[PDB]
Design a protein around this nucleic acid. Structure first.
Ligand SMILES: [Mg+2]
Ligand SMILES: [Mg+2]
Length: 206
DNA sequence: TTGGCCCAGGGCCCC
């Protein structure tokens, strides 16, 4: 009933990014939050550690106005508190490598909504900053849109949360911290409901 | 417990 036995040794980490566009290679990463997970004694999954950073646009990054219109971020504001892609990701990777070790996992896997998006941005930022020993799987993800489709019959984040019996706020939507937390709680509830229904462990049904 | 965008009104929701 250990975390390391749940996902074949993958350590699931919830990620949401806010960006200045849809292209991971050309558009600025502006914000990232990460939430690691843990299992209790009863084997229920739940949020553990929470990290959140404002990110300084990389050298030569594009900034799409419509993106900034959508997320309401201003990369010029000297008050936002931005750090380098190197800084935010170094911190995230350190906390993650520590969680992998403590739980006896061997690799992290990104949990995110329409996960290829956040995965592509984090990987692009890691490559730019030349971070070595990136603990995240280089192509596998746990997409909560697909998981919600299965569990809840909904793929839109806000709707999936509401369908799962969670609160989800519009006026708080479109900020990394809130997004990541709701996503983490959605993922945990999906995993936990599968367990409550006797789908896990694989021996439980019989 | 989406308001606003994008291809008048409908449907979309990873920025
Ligand atoms: Mg968001
Ligand atoms: Mg997102």
């Amino acid at each position: 009933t250990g975390l390391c036995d749940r996902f074949r040794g993958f350590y699931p980490v919830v990620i949401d990014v806010e960006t200045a566009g849809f292209n991971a290679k050309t558009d600025a990463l502006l914000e990232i939050a990460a939430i690691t997970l843990k299992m209790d004694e009863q084997g229920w999954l739940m949020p553990d550690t929470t990290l959140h950073f404002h990110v300084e646009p990389f050298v030569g990054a594009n900034l799409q106005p419509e993106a900034l219109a959508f997320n309401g971020i201003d990369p010029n504001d000297p008050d936002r508190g931005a750090v380098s892609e190197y800084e935010a990701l170094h911190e995230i990777f350190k906390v993650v490598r520590k969680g992998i070790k403590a739980s006896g996992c061997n690799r992290a896997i990104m949990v995110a909504h329409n996960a290829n998006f956040d995965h592509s941005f984090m990987m692009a930022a890691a490559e730019r900053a030349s971070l070595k020993r990136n603990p995240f799987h280089p192509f596998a993800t746990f997409d909560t849109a697909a998981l919600a489709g299965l569990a809840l019959g909904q793929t839109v984040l806000s709707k999936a949360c509401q369908t799962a019996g969670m609160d989800f706020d519009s006026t708080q939507a479109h900020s990394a911290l809130y997004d990541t937390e709701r996503t983490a709680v959605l993922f945990c509830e999906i995993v936990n409901r599968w367990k409550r229904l006797g789908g896990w462990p694989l021996s439980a049904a019989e």
